[PDB]
Amino acid sequence: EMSSILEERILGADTSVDLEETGRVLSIGDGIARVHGLRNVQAEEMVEFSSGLKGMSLNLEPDNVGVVVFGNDKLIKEGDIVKRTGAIVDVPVGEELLGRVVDALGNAIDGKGPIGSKTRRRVGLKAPGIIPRISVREPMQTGIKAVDSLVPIGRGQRELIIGDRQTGKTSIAIDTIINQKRFNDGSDEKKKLYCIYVAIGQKRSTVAQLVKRLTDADAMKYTIVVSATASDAAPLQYLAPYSGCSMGEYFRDNGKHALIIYDDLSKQAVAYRQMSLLLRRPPGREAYPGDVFYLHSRLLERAAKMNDAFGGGSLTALPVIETQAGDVSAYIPTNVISITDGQIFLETELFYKGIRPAINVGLSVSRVGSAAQTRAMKQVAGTMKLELAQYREVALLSRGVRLTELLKQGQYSPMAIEEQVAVIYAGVRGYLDKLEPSKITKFENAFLSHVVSQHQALLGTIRADGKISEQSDAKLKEIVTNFLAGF
């Protein structure tokens, strides 16, 4: 402005100078600085280079310290001065981050000023033990029919989204994030889910497109986007998931419910492999370090569902894994499959057969299952799952085709649970074995339009009770038969 750039952006700047313990860069190359000195620096402590850069002290060797650089090592020369910070790596946590795009260290990259964060939180904290947790009961609503019906997800669960490239994993995550809009602006406080999206190793314009999609649907007012893109140093892409997880643990520890998507963890594993090979640590399978399973398990163990003596918070994780040529038996895919509480398998064969989302219901699993569902969706989805199985072994058969064409869904169109259960009702009770599949989606579009235009009271009772009572079942029978007559 005209005076507001000196008044406190200068006069208040903490220009103090103090005696600080330092070291000296012996060598620097490929983002790994070997610092002589720093006798009292702690393991995994954040240090600071004389050129404004920052780094984490990973290797504590007898003659030097292996400092990984959070940035570009072009600015660092031999003989530079590395000053301690005294604190292990920590990120700013709070509610102010909601609506911001930050990098792996919590700095704003959307140009909207500093985050007004009061508290900070380590990134390498310990997950809650056995006592602070409780069973995963509340449902996390995605708005996707196949997920919310056959692979339901709870609050506190770790559901893996796994598939090849360009199969629809990011789209599943984006639908899940957009769907929480109805609950977030509503009245019931313990149905609000604050989403978090971690972009690891992605192209920067992809994250720009994603932020545009999430702000077009007004879904950014409750979403944090941590982004360690492909041009960011390997330590930043390795630290992004832990930063995002701490930002979500803030909510989880304070009676609120959060959701975090790691998109994806294959690139975090690759960044960690690079960062550890450059530290001269011996490689393992596929040159990955020995402790990459630990790298992912200590991260996915922090997604918990706390009990009421701890606030009743929650943190649902949705790790993403890319596989090479459908090879699910690789190293990192098998690690993360062993860690998580279920999977959502996507295939390109199903994707090109018109089945979108290409969720393989045969392989998709939810280890919690029915415990993470509403009663009405459970009532319909049991029979729907069994009928879809019966169709998949004999690929009745027309009812199964009708059900699969019912499962198909568009992009960025997350339905409500009430509408979802009404559709799968109209599908499993028999009112669709008369239409030809090439008009099934037409019927559902028109039927949803009609029901949301005329029958808000039935859907309101569905949303209030959670059960499809005999009164509700009869009224829904009425509506579906009359519309089928109209169609």
Binding site: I28, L75, I109, Q274, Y352
Partner: protein, 466 residues
């Protein structure tokens, strides 16, 4: 600052500076060579010693030779004077037309555009090619990749894209030859001279050429991509123009990085690649992007080693592209050219809200019928064609007709196939494939759709064969 060479192993030269150790990425000049030998600092080793990477051949380097630090990274001439010229990795004219008289020089090592400079507009770019426009359409300002093994048609397809899009363009174009045949560079130079695109007599040239080919040491093949990037980045930022950036081949960048990483004293990663594969590829690819200061329509040919699409280099370069055109050898054996794999090429603008419901439905129906044919392939191969239902037989017939129709004669192929080059507008593509899907041509033979333009030409060929 003046140092002395203390080690020479291939392309990696160690220098020991008695004072003023140069920063990383600086460009050092070796004293006493017939030509200019530039060493790019890569690491600091301690003991006042740096480990550089030579941009040219290292034969004749003696331990103790003098090396001066220039004080800045490799700087190339940028501007409107580089149009119609050819320059090597370090920015020297290699066309025997004298110096490049520019007013500004830009280092080849710049920071990627930040997050707040990204633009999100995804207008379609029509190419005139059937399979590309139909199933994996390109976008103005997006990043395009043409994958493919050895001898499947990456260069033919990129020359077809140059023929259709480059000379029909308004802005400027940049072709960065990265580790490919020098005779192809000569062919391109002379073709652009005859086509008026490159004009040796005045300043109406529209293409800047940057060439470090497969006869170059690994340092030059690793940095010539950055030289091309820098030229295109000037044309985008300081001119606001809409630039076309063609890179062939972008895999040689990673391959040369691996070759030099062998000697830089680094523990190798998988398939013997550098541990810093994805990070170097990211720091290079995040500069090839459209910002809100200008657009860069990037088409990059990507070689695939041993026809393995899961190799670390192509598997890492997939995540940087807005539209991938994966070529296949199994399809190229059938004479179907271009060999674009229809069930493997994708695009982020294959979106009904963007291309239209008609186009989206035609593309998805073509892909579904091709996937059905692919699923039937096994039974067809073992138990013969007879054991299919007649519905499966109809699906197979329509799918084979669609396969033949996806083929197309290229205008650049007028010298080794004889057939005239067909440029099919988007409407003709959608209409022809919709008609074939509807069954309007279940009486024409499949060899009537092979190597034609619009669908009317397929009908005419069907009539001519009878």
């Amino acid at each position: 600052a003046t140092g002395r060479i203390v080690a020479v192993i291939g392309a990696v030269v160690d220098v020991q500076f008695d004072e003023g150790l140069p920063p990383i990425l600086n460009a050092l000049e070796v004293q006493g060579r017939e030509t200019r030998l530039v060493l790019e600092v890569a690491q600091h080793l301690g003991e006042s010693t740096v480990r550089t990477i030579a941009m040219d051949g290292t034969e004749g380097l003696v331990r103790g030779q003098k090396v001066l630090d220039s004080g800045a990274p490799i700087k190339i001439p940028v501007g409107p004077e580089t149009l119609g010229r050819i320059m090597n990795v370090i920015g020297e004219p290699i066309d025997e037309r004298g110096p490049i008289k520019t007013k500004q020089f830009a280092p080849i090592h710049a920071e990627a555009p930040e997050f707040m400079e990204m633009s999100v507009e995804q207008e379609i770019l029509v190419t005139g090619i059937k399979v590309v426009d139909l199933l994996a359409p390109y976008a103005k300002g997006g990043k395009i990749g043409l994958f493919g093994g050895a001898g499947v048609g990456k260069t033919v397809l990129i020359m077809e894209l140059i023929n259709n899009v480059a000379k029909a363009h308004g802005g400027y174009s940049v072709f960065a030859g990265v580790g490919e045949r020098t005779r192809e560079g000569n062919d391109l130079y002379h073709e652009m001279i005859e086509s008026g695109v490159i004009n040796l007599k005045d300043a109406t040239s529209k293409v800047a050429l940057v060439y470090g080919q497969m006869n170059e040491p690994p340092g030059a093949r690793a940095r010539v991509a950055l030289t091309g990037l820098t030229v295109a980045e000037y044309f985008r930022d300081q001119e606001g123009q809409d630039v076309l950036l063609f890179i062939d081949n972008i895999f040689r960048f990673t391959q040369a990085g691996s070759e030099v990483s062998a000697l830089l004293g680094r523990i190798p990663s998988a398939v013997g690649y550098q541990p810093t594969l994805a990070t170097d590829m990211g720091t290079m690819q995040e500069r090839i992007t459209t910002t809100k200061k200008g657009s860069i329509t990037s088409v990059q040919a990507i070689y695939v080693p041993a026809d393995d699409l899961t190799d670390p280099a192509p598997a890492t370069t997939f995540a940087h592209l807005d539209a991938t055109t994966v070529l296949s050898r199994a399809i190229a054996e059938l004479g179907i050219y271009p060999a674009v794999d229809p069930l493997d090429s994708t695009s982020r603008i294959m979106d009904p809200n963007i291309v239209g419901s008609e186009h989206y439905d035609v593309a998805r129906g073509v892909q579904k019928i091709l996937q059905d044919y692919k699923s039937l392939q096994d039974i067809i191969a073992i138990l013969g064609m007879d054991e299919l239902s007649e519905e499966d037989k109809l699906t197979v017939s329509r799918a084979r007709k669609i396969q033949r129709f996806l083929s197309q004669p290229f205008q650049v192929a007028e010298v080794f196939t004889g057939h005239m080059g067909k440029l099919v507008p988007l409407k003709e593509t959608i209409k022809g494939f919709q008609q074939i899907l509807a069954g309007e041509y279940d009486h024409l033979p499949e060899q009537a759709f092979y190597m034609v333009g619009p669908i009317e030409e397929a009908v005419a060929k069907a009539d001519k064969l009878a």
